[PDB]
Amino acid sequence: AYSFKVVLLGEGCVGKTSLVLRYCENKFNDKHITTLQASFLTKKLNIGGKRVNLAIWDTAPIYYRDSNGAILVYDITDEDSFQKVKNWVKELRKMLGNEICLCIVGNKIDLEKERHVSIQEAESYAESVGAKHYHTSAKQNKGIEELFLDLCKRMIET
Template identity: 65%
Template structure:
């Protein structure tokens, strides 16, 4: 039986209030969408398992509040995250500017360790788009992120969004483990070589009769 490699990842959703973060998570985890909008209070937490060939990823998804009064709590929720999904509303240009601020903050706090995806949500309202798609995709490229167009209402792009960030987190985790293994191997090899050198340099005792 083939061994299955297991991963545990923390993913945080960030963005302005009413951009659809909660709707995206509920659609992805439970396959549900509600027209009624209820603002998230501080943060909510859901889990999802993703199966890939020979691998299983368990996602702990944190849906954070977007209201300004909860902004100071952001670091509490994205601390120790391996992935971050930055959500904006394609009909609200200001919500995209807020995403740019979040990315600066994430890079400052977590560096390149965190995998970032940008979600342009509510593409079911394409006729009301307020920001050019090419501009958003170009920006994502400049910050090492990937852009996905989504709609929680019509369930568009959501599986791609979470699959993409999971794939990136697995690649980064594997790369980190491989680098650690190489460093440890070099360290052990160096240690063994140093012992040999020391042994070679030890003067041989002469026989009292020599």
């Protein structure tokens, strides 16, 4: 059975912790500060027969060490959060081998009426650095099951 390590990256306030809490426990709160009550949480999967042990890491070399995939999140309502995405890529590449499966993720899509990131622009940067781009809303639970499933499959292929 497959054992994968996945790290969450990006600026504060974008929804990194909400994403892990939503995926792993189906909880979401916008009333107080959320903090992961562990270094990582475990999720088990079955993909076309085979089992997958997933360890999802969050933070408020030990962190980067032994990672197979990476989830780099920005906030669709906030252009600075996106423009800082490139700093994290040019830190992920310093820490780890360019063999790691990277996701770039536009979170908070329930707030579309307040969008400030260009979809074209975001998807273009993703392709140029070899990664895939995804849209999520932790609040409404949209796009998240698909993000983790596709990442798991990508890590299985290489």
